Amino acid sequence: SGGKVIQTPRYLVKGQGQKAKMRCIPEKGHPVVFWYQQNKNNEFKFLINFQNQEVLQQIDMTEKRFSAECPSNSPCSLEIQSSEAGDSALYLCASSLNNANSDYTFGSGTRLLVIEDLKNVFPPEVAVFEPSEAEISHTQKATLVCLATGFYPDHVELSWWVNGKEVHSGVCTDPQPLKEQPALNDSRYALSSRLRVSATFWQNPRNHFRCQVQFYGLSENDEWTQDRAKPVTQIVSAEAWGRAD
Amino acid sequence: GDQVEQSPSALSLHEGTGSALRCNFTTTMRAVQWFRKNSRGSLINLFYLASGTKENGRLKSAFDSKERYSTLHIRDAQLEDSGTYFCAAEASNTNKVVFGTGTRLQVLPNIQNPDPAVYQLRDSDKSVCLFTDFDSQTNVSQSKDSDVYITDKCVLDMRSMDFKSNSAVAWSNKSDFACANAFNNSIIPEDTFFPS
Amino acid sequence: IKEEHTIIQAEFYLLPDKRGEFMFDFDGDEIFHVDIEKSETIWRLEEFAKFASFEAQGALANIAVDKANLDVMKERSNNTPDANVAPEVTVLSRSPVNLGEPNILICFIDKFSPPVVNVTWLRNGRPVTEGVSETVFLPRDDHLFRKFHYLTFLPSTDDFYDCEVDHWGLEEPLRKHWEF
Amino acid sequence: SRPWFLEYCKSECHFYNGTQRVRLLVRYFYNLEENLRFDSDVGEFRAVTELGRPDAENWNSQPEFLEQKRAEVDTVCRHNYEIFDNFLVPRRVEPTVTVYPLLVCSVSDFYPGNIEVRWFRNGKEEKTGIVSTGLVRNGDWTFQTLVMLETVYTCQVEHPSLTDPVTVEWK
């Protein structure tokens, strides 16, 4: 499609030594493709570029440690053969039309985290809190709060759904999820969000509010020998119904 | 170290003000590009300049090939303008696109009618505390004791009613925890409304 | 008091010879060229390198694209008709010739296409291999090419030199003469 | 005969009066035929022969590409001129003038090609019976020429590398 570049998956967590394959769909009609690796300092590391199927340029690391191809009528791919801690970064795909140009258009990017132990992976607990009655009398407005807690890694995307429709107006979600335990590493995370609507709207009991959390974790192929449930990629929700006076 | 000098590093704008970003090049660039990365958003393509100036809504961009700079101007700053801004250009004497160091822009909302208040919310049986309706001059500070959590402040926009509000959430399991002492760690407005 | 000049970037890829060429021209003279195989910039006068730089792989990259483009043009053109523009050859001395005084003979091949020739220097009718210099294919105002061949020599009334140039447009190898 | 295939491209930077007036002329060739042109004075690609029409249509649909190219009059052309103005443009090499028996004036080893040669017999410029070889480019950033007079006697050479004119005279 276009003018948009589709990178999948949004997040990805892999164990040290495992393969990490990520995909990218360049803009329709766009022959030029670049792979950049961005670190924590907002530095853009060039990996490799293609013209269609042919590789124009790549670095020593992508040659030795990565395997990438951009097949005809197929999603472009970049795969790490053996993931290590140093490969944790944001991988960006950008497509162009004319090799002798700038005008990159970047994709959403794939956030990759590489960890030693996959037993540290936990899905999020989702809880919705109903508007305080004090706020309604004082402000004639109603704020719902959603709390996602106890997930790892910090790879989640929150959404508010009012009556089966995704809403954006009057919504506020934390910039960065906070560590539930700053001390210690591999600590689980917490994330909050608010949905404010007018008091009169909240007092209509036919209106349905749902907080939906997308967790990016293990996949079906990953092995799981623990007692607790397999922490795969999943949606966890909590909801609430409208309430009269 | 091999990037473009982009200033300023960080920037805070009051809603409706303006400022300018600037990239300084070490040589002749063939053309310049500007990006914004939203909050949990993708990289948004803002401009492609080869010469002169281009203006897009509240954004104007300029590129002087000879004087080896490019500027991005923001006017009438809005909430959605918040994010990280990058420049990217390739030298006329090479084949390689190089990026700017980046500029983090935070836009502070204009709170016409501040009404600082703290409410308690029940599970639809846990409970959380909501600091809300304070002005942008208030800074929210992290909770100390490891049993209470407090999030950084956040701005929401009810577009239908042209109303914006700051808000921060705090919660805990400990029984010594009440909303009255939730946001004690921060310097809150003196006239903060405490119900119940 | 009017500075009027021209700078040309000339590059090509040739089949079936499978070679490409990349160079810069200033007002009719070579500034430099890039050895595509070796990947290094070759300044026409050594003194130029003290003032300027050219990233060599830049030229390599272009030729690769030019290679690819050649295939596209081939499939595009319904009929590619072989045609040749034959060279015109001229031999003369770089400096006024004095006996026993070291000098250079210049073989000036001009106005030809394709950019492929066989050039041979002849002292007394026999090929010469020592003291010979060559220039890449140089650009013109038109679609045609230009070339220089040099030969260092000591003047004497006993020796006579020849430059023999063969090109796909000549019926018979063109041989141009020079003696004292 | 022997079939051949050439993909030739010349990008010309034209400087009239330094970097005041500059135009870019990119010319694409296929074997013997110029097929595509980019004239900075036109700002778009133009097909010279039908063979170049597809490229022209393709590239002219790319505004940000064309925008970059028109700018190459500054980003590439004037860029390079600034560099070359330090050693190539001001390059001066003093000519060597020689006279030998028709009378020959041999002006050799000079740069640039701006050269004026006159013949004076008894102090008047013999503006007749002049056979010149024209300007000759040695290809090594040096020039040479032979100006001849057909009479049965002094020649003067004027050049940008000479503060004062060079004169030679024969017995």
């Binding site: - | - | 970037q9 | 491209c9 390079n80």
Partner: peptide, 14 residues
């Protein structure tokens, strides 16, 4: 060591 600028070749196609 000032680095000369050059024109970059663009792939022909569709």
């Amino acid at each position: 060591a000032d680095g000369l600028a050059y024109f970059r070749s663009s792939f022909k196609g569709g």
